[PDB]
Amino acid sequence: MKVEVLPALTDNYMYLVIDDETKEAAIVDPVQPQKVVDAARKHGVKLTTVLTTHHHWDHAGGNEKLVKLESGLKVYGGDDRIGALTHKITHLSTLQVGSLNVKCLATPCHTSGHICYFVSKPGGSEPPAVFTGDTLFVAGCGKFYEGTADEMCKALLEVLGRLPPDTRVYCGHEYTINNLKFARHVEPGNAAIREKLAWAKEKYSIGEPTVPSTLAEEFTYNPFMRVREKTVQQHAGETDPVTTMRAVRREKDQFKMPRD
Amino acid sequence: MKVEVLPALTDNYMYLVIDDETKEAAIVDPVQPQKVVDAARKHGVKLTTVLTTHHHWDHAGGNEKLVKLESGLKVYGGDDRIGALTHKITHLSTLQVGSLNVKCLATPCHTSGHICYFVSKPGGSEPPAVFTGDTLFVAGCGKFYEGTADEMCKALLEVLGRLPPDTRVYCGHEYTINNLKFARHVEPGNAAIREKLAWAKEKYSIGEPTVPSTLAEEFTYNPFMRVREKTVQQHAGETDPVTTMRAVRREKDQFKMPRD
Ligand SMILES: C[As](C)(=O)[O-]
Ligand SMILES: C[As](C)(=O)[O-]
Ligand SMILES: [Cl-]
Ligand SMILES: [Mn+2]
Ligand SMILES: [Mn+2]
Ligand SMILES: [Zn+2]
Ligand SMILES: [Zn+2]
Ligand SMILES: [Zn+2]
Ligand SMILES: [Zn+2]
Numbered sequence: 001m002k003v004e005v006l007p008a009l010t011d012n013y014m015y016l017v018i019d020d021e022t023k024e025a026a027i028v029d030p031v032q033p034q035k036v037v038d039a040a041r042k043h044g045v046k047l048t049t050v051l052t053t054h055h056h057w058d059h060a061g062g063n064e065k066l067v068k069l070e071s072g073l074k075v076y077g078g079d080d081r082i083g084a085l086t087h088k089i090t091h092l093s094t095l096q097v098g099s100l101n102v103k104c105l106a107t108p109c110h111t112s113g114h115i116c117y118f119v120s121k122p123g124g125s126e127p128p129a130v131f132t133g134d135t136l137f138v139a140g141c142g143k144f145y146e147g148t149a150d151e152m153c154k155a156l157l158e159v160l161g162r163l164p165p166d167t168r169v170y171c172g173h174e175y176t177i178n179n180l181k182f183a184r185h186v187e188p189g190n191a192a193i194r195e196k197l198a199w200a201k202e203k204y205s206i207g208e209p210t211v212p213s214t215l216a217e218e219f220t221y222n223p224f225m226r227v228r229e230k231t232v233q234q235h236a237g238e239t240d241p242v243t244t245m246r247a248v249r250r251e252k253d254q255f256k257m258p259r260d
Numbered sequence: 261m262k263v264e265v266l267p268a269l270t271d272n273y274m275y276l277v278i279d280d281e282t283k284e285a286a287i288v289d290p291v292q293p294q295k296v297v298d299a300a301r302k303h304g305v306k307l308t309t310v311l312t313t314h315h316h317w318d319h320a321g322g323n324e325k326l327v328k329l330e331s332g333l334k335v336y337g338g339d340d341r342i343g344a345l346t347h348k349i350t351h352l353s354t355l356q357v358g359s360l361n362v363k364c365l366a367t368p369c370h371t372s373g374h375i376c377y378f379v380s381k382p383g384g385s386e387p388p389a390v391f392t393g394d395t396l397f398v399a400g401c402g403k404f405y406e407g408t409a410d411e412m413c414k415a416l417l418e419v420l421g422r423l424p425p426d427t428r429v430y431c432g433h434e435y436t437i438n439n440l441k442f443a444r445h446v447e448p449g450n451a452a453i454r455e456k457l458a459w460a461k462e463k464y465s466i467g468e469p470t471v472p473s474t475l476a477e478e479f480t481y482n483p484f485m486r487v488r489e490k491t492v493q494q495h496a497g498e499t500d501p502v503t504t505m506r507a508v509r510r511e512k513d514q515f516k517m518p519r520d
Contacts, residue, residue: 247516255497256497
């Protein structure tokens with residue numbers, strides 16, 4: 001398996017997921033289709049599938065066009081608002097990309113139709129990948145536009161959180177630095193935050209993406225993934241993960257980003 | 261002048277403003293009219309005037325019924341939505357209640373037609389009074405249902421804020437304890453807040469209203485009146501009173517009240 005990170009718009013990431021065995025590939029959130037087709041040509045792969053994390057235009061807005069550029073494409077998504085949708089899927093739906101196995105995980109909150117795609121190589125020895133759209137970011141999470149703190153708690157801790165720790169996290173946007181500046185405010189004594197921020201500033205400095213991260217890593221520095229930790233709860237002044245989730249999300253929403 | 265505080269509903273306050281000379285009186289926000297009538301009868305005074313701070317039902321909801329219980333009433337307000345008006349007033353409108361002088365102050369924000377009433381007796385042998393409805397509370401302010409942070413800033417610091425410091429503040433509700441618990445969170449090092457909170461808790465215990473406060477006191481413990489203070493701005497992460505106002509109000513809107 002190969003995952004090529006493709007920057008789009010201002011801070012979006014599209015992901016070309018390649019099956020080495022068959023050369024078949026899937027494209028996650030193809031908002032800039034010519035860019036997808038170029039990457040597909042560059043890697044010599046055959047694009048057969050579109051995996052849409054949610055209906056927000058910055059993620060699904062290129063589906064109509066890509067389908068006119070490439071025939072035969074199967075467009076997956078868990079929301080009728082997604083353009084050019086061909087295969088409406090739900091929690092635990094599965095599909096294959098060549099030899100790769102894709103498991104659809106419903107993570108409603110950011111949007112009610114949000115789907116994260118867990119991709120693995122059956123029998124393989126390579127770590128799997130999870131495409132988390134605007135549900136889980138590196139050190140952050142999406143705003144709760146169509147959902148509650150309870151829903152995000154379930155998405156992050158019970159659905160994504162139970163995937164293997166070595167799962168690579170490929171999220172919707174390049175928000176890592178700001179996410180970590182917020183994480184640093186929530187837990188000033190947490191060194192994993194501070195070192196991941198040093199690392200992200202350096203990547204930013206040289207024009208390289210901060211994805212992927214791993215789930216084990218998110219449990220060390222992402223305040224939303226750490227709503228069960230006593231340090232995060234005490235910062236919020238709560239004693240359960242759902243109310244801590246609600247408080248930390250509201251806090252992040254009004255947080256003024258420091259310049260360093 | 262004599263101001264009789266009259267509790268109504270669950271935490272509302274109506275105010276019978278008595279001119280001890282002519283034995284004439286005005287009533288502020290007469291939501292429970294029969295209660296008003298008994299009060300006027302207990303104090304041997306003739307009700308002549310109704311002063312309405314704003315159209316919300318818990319303030320203006322008894323106007324039509326009061327006019328039906330009492331004839332010849334003059335009913336003032338600065339908003340067409342107020343029932344039973346006889347006189348529509350605006351910023352700086354003046355009127356008299358017996359020997360008392362009344363000055364209308366427009367404080368749009370909570371509602372667009374909100375009016376605060378400044379009452380004084382000529383040849384100041386006693387402190388004036390300001391009836392602030394849902395604009396200024398003891399240690400708090402009203403939600404910005406029909407206006408902006410700029411508007412509340414003006415209403416509080418420039419329109420009310422510039423009245424004599426000894427002016428008594430008679431607000432629409434008994435929200436003092438909760439207001440100060442939020443204030444304490446904004447400024448944990450402010451002794452005036454913790455002292456007023458302890459006092460408010462005791463007044464609540466013996467069934468005594470926390471009104472009136474004075475404008476001078478409000479400047480020592482009300483976060484909304486203190487948006488020019490470095491401590492409040494630091495809490496909000498801002499450096500100007502208007503953005504501080506916006507941030508502090510948004511925060512209070514979603515603040516979880518602690519048990520003590
Ligand atoms: C803030 As969005 C439009 O990337 O869900
Ligand atoms: C919350 As209200 C109805 O007293 O403006
Ligand atoms: Cl805060
Ligand atoms: Mn904070
Ligand atoms: Mn706060
Ligand atoms: Zn989105
Ligand atoms: Zn997005
Ligand atoms: Zn009101
Ligand atoms: Zn009210």
